Design a protein around this ligand. Structure first.
Ligand SMILES: O=c1[nH]cnc2c(CNC[C@@H](O)CP(=O)(O)O)c[nH]c12
Ligand SMILES: O=c1[nH]cnc2c(CNC[C@@H](O)CP(=O)(O)O)c[nH]c12
Lengths: 212, 216
């Protein structure tokens, strides 16, 4: 499954498509999807037994259900593709959940959910590298929403890039200590649509200097 | 896929019961086939075109990774459709970038979230939207993007067209699926954020629309 080779220009070819911007393949689509689905099962297994504030039936505590679902906050723009795939796997495993979005760059877009007090909240994020983005988001969500519990699921962990303490509760994949592209990962919004994750050729992070 | 009803008259797809569903509209395989077919049409239409060159600060240049097609996806309902469409657009080699805007009705329309792209003048812009029903949401978005960003061209691709719902003239350029004149759920379509994760699209039993009254 997946034919991985190099053409005469030394460029990586996966299933007949060339990736001239890539240094090495990190993970094929088949490996990525198997990893996400495996973590979806872990998430569903962990949350389905839990209970939290009942906002459907007038208190007090009730099981996670369609009436009181797990609250998922997805971080835009980086996590939208990962989130789309993950929620479908969570549905397959029967986890009741709802998704809202926050956008960070500075907070550019706020959540519209306003009843998260005493609720189980899960953040879906693309990658933990330095740890600074999640420290910022976790502090913000805890103080404004006062959730019962706050956990983080990342598609990717780059353990070698840490500047601050940040250990996600759920991790689908471990990536090399290199700039990654594909499956949501980008260079000025380019390359997010790839089905595979690759490392970027050095210096190519400046390929598109013009602001969109 | 196997689509049937159980002994309680409840629709079952691939062993999973959908008690909130009146009818199945489309299976995952039909939806994905339909999206990929539109991705080919979008790629074939835009691949040969050119627009403002912001990479070489020049005049005009072909759609490329240097000057990509600009896609504006309408949150929240379009995020799953968009995730799938962009991967199919990549399969067909269409250079593109995606930003997001969010809209809501109070009925009259209001912007909830603005796009962050600031150089769209003279660019080809494609709106990705979950559904065209009354047409009011897209008339509002198209009028706003046109006057504020001055794009070279402005087109719309919808996952679903509900033809009977029209109250203002609106025919998206690209349509993946046609749905019945009923409330649809699944594959991004929701009842108070429930049911978006379903891989299939269904019509909603009318009594289920106010099942989840509490604000999230
Ligand atoms: O490898 C990468 N490929 C593409 N984008 C990035 C980023 C930027 N976005 C995530 C960060 O903002 C998380 P943070 O570092 O704060 O934890 C870091 N690494 C990579
Ligand atoms: O069938 C449906 N299932 C779930 N949600 C909806 C909506 C709301 N969101 C889209 C509209 O806001 C577009 P508009 O009507 O203005 O074109 C309309 N139809 C359905």
């Amino acid at each position: 499954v997946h034919v991985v080779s190099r053409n005469a220009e030394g460029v990586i070819v996966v299933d007949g498509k060339a990736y001239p911007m890539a240094e090495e393949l990190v993970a094929t689509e088949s490996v990525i999807q198997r990893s996400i689905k495996a973590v979806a099962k872990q998430i569903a297994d962990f949350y389905r037994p839990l209970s939290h504030r009942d906002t459907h039936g007038g208190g007090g505590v009730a099981p996670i259900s369609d009436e009181n679902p797990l609250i998922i906050i997805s971080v835009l723009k980086g996590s939208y593709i990962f989130t789309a795939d993950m929620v479908r796997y969570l549905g397959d495993y029967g986890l009741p959940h709802v998704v809202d979005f926050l956008r960070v760059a500075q907070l550019l877009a706020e959540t519209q959910f306003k009843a998260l007090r005493g609720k189980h909240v899960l953040i879906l994020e693309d990658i933990v590298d330095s740890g600074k983005t999640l420290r910022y988001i976790l502090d913000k969500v805890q103080r404004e929403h006062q959730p019962a519990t706050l956990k983080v699921c990342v598609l990717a962990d780059k353990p070698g890039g840490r500047r601050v303490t940040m250990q996600p509760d759920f991790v689908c994949l471990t990536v090399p200590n290199k700039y990654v592209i594909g499956y949501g990962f980008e260079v000025n919004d380019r390359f997010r649509c790839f089905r595979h994750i690759f490392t970027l050729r050095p210096g190519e992070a400046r390929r598109y200097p013009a602001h969109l």
